[PDB]
Amino acid sequence: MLKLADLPESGQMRLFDGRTGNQFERPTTVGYMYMLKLNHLVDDKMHAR
DNA sequence: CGGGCTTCGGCCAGAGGTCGAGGGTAATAAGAGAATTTATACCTTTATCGTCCCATAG
């Protein structure tokens, strides 16, 4: 599927830094992961007396 | 052969992390009427304490 979508078959490629703008020496893993948000908001946890 | 004497088995007590966070649920039916006490309400009587006139001591 990856090689069909013109993406690296290993699923990894070298990213560019966001501040210095220099490529990382080794390639990292990037992809779209289904992230959740749980009902543990800090808005309901912050108390102070 | 009864008797101290050790040991064992059944029975009960106590103790089991902390700190959050949220939610919910928490408990009813004799009337009559007689009687006794108590808080209330008005009123009078005595003392009390605020109040000022007056003689006097310096």
CSV table of N, CA, C and O in Angstrom, one decimal, chain A residues 2-33:
chain,number,residue,atom,x,y,z
A,2,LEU,N,1.9,1.3,0.8
A,2,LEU,CA,2.8,2.4,0.9
A,2,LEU,C,3.5,2.6,-0.5
A,2,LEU,O,3.6,3.8,-0.9
A,3,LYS,N,4.0,1.6,-1.1
A,3,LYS,CA,4.7,1.7,-2.4
A,3,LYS,C,3.7,2.1,-3.5
A,3,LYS,O,4.1,2.6,-4.5
A,4,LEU,N,2.4,1.8,-3.3
A,4,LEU,CA,1.4,2.1,-4.2
A,4,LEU,C,1.1,3.6,-4.1
A,4,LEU,O,0.7,4.3,-5.1
A,5,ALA,N,1.2,4.2,-2.9
A,5,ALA,CA,0.9,5.6,-2.7
A,5,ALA,C,2.1,6.5,-2.8
A,5,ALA,O,2.0,7.7,-2.4
A,6,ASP,N,3.1,6.0,-3.5
A,6,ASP,CA,4.3,6.8,-3.7
A,6,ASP,C,5.0,7.3,-2.4
A,6,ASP,O,5.6,8.4,-2.4
A,7,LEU,N,4.9,6.6,-1.4
A,7,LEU,CA,5.5,6.9,-0.1
A,7,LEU,C,6.6,5.8,0.2
A,7,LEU,O,6.6,4.8,-0.4
A,8,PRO,N,7.6,6.2,1.0
A,8,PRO,CA,8.6,5.2,1.3
A,8,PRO,C,8.1,3.9,1.8
A,8,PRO,O,7.2,3.9,2.7
A,9,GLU,N,8.6,2.8,1.3
A,9,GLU,CA,8.1,1.5,1.7
A,9,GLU,C,8.4,1.2,3.1
A,9,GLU,O,7.6,0.5,3.8
A,10,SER,N,9.5,1.7,3.7
A,10,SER,CA,9.8,1.5,5.1
A,10,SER,C,8.8,2.3,6.0
A,10,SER,O,8.8,2.1,7.2
A,11,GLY,N,8.1,3.3,5.5
A,11,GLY,CA,7.2,4.1,6.3
A,11,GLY,C,8.0,5.3,7.0
A,11,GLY,O,7.4,5.9,7.9
A,12,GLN,N,9.2,5.6,6.6
A,12,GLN,CA,10.0,6.6,7.3
A,12,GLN,C,10.7,7.4,6.3
A,12,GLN,O,11.1,7.0,5.2
A,13,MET,N,10.9,8.7,6.6
A,13,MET,CA,11.7,9.6,5.8
A,13,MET,C,12.3,10.6,6.7
A,13,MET,O,11.7,10.9,7.8
A,14,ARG,N,13.4,11.3,6.3
A,14,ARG,CA,14.1,12.2,7.1
A,14,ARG,C,13.3,13.5,7.1
A,14,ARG,O,13.0,14.1,6.1
A,15,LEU,N,12.9,14.0,8.3
A,15,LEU,CA,12.2,15.2,8.6
A,15,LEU,C,13.2,16.4,8.7
A,15,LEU,O,14.4,16.2,8.9
A,16,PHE,N,12.6,17.6,8.5
A,16,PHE,CA,13.4,18.8,8.6
A,16,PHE,C,13.0,19.5,9.9
A,16,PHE,O,11.9,19.5,10.3
A,17,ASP,N,14.0,20.0,10.6
A,17,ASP,CA,13.8,20.6,11.9
A,17,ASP,C,13.0,21.9,11.7
A,17,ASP,O,13.1,22.5,10.7
A,18,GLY,N,12.2,22.3,12.7
A,18,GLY,CA,11.3,23.4,12.6
A,18,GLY,C,12.0,24.7,13.0
A,18,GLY,O,11.4,25.8,12.6
A,19,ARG,N,13.1,24.7,13.7
A,19,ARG,CA,13.7,25.9,14.2
A,19,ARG,C,15.0,26.1,13.4
A,19,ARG,O,15.2,27.2,12.8
A,20,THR,N,16.0,25.2,13.4
A,20,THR,CA,17.2,25.3,12.7
A,20,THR,C,17.1,24.9,11.2
A,20,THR,O,18.0,25.3,10.4
A,21,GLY,N,16.0,24.2,10.8
A,21,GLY,CA,15.8,23.9,9.5
A,21,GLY,C,16.7,22.9,8.9
A,21,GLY,O,16.8,22.8,7.6
A,22,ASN,N,17.5,22.2,9.7
A,22,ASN,CA,18.4,21.2,9.1
A,22,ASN,C,17.9,19.8,9.3
A,22,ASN,O,17.3,19.4,10.3
A,23,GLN,N,18.0,19.0,8.3
A,23,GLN,CA,17.5,17.6,8.2
A,23,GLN,C,18.1,16.8,9.4
A,23,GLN,O,19.3,16.8,9.6
A,24,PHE,N,17.3,16.0,10.0
A,24,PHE,CA,17.8,15.1,11.0
A,24,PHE,C,18.6,14.0,10.3
A,24,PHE,O,18.3,13.6,9.2
A,25,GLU,N,19.7,13.5,10.9
A,25,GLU,CA,20.6,12.6,10.3
A,25,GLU,C,19.9,11.3,10.0
A,25,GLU,O,20.1,10.6,9.0
A,26,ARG,N,19.1,10.8,11.0
A,26,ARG,CA,18.4,9.5,10.8
A,26,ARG,C,16.9,9.7,10.5
A,26,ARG,O,16.3,10.7,11.0
A,27,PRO,N,16.3,8.9,9.7
A,27,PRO,CA,14.9,9.1,9.4
A,27,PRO,C,13.9,8.6,10.5
A,27,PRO,O,14.1,7.6,11.1
A,28,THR,N,12.9,9.5,10.7
A,28,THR,CA,11.9,9.2,11.8
A,28,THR,C,10.6,8.7,11.2
A,28,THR,O,10.4,8.7,9.9
A,29,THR,N,9.7,8.3,12.0
A,29,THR,CA,8.4,7.7,11.6
A,29,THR,C,7.4,8.8,11.8
A,29,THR,O,7.2,9.4,12.8
A,30,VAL,N,6.7,9.0,10.7
A,30,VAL,CA,5.6,10.0,10.6
A,30,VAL,C,4.4,9.3,9.9
A,30,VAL,O,4.5,8.6,9.0
A,31,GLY,N,3.2,9.6,10.5
A,31,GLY,CA,2.0,9.0,9.9
A,31,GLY,C,0.8,9.5,10.7
A,31,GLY,O,0.9,10.3,11.7
A,32,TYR,N,-0.4,9.1,10.2
A,32,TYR,CA,-1.6,9.6,10.7
A,32,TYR,C,-2.2,8.6,11.7
A,32,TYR,O,-2.7,7.6,11.3
A,33,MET,N,-2.2,9.0,13.0
A,33,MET,CA,-2.6,8.1,14.1
A,33,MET,C,-3.9,8.7,14.7
A,33,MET,O,-4.0,9.9,15.0
